[PDB]
């Protein structure tokens, strides 16, 4: 019954996949782009001059 609801309603199914894809492009633009999701140990540096 679940998949037939969509087979009977062609525009509903495509509406949904357009939303999924629009959300996708909003998402990729927002997402950070990096080489590795690796976590580097966070560091604090203290410098003094004499």
């Amino acid at each position: 019954m679940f998949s037939k609801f969509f087979i009977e309603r062609p525009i509903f199914a495509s509406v949904v996949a357009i939303i999924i894809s629009i959300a996708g492009i909003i998402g990729l633009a927002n997402l950070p782009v990096e080489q590795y999701p690796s976590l580097t140990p966070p560091t604090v540096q203290v410098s003094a001059t004499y």
Partner: protein
């Protein structure tokens, strides 16, 4: 033009935000309309309606 090259211009408050504006609202409004279009298209099962 009036001030010298030695001068420089910076902004504060409302002006700063307007100069540093990502046009975010505009993109959001277009998306909102497109979403409204599609969600009523689903209700009526018609693209035109």
């Amino acid at each position: 033009q009036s001030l010298g090259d030695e001068y420089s211009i910076a902004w504060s408050g409302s002006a700063y935000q307007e100069v540093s504006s990502k046009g975010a609202g505009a993109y959001a409004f277009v998306l909102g309309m497109i979403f409204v279009f599609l969600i009523l298209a689903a209700q009526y099962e018609r693209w035109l309606m």
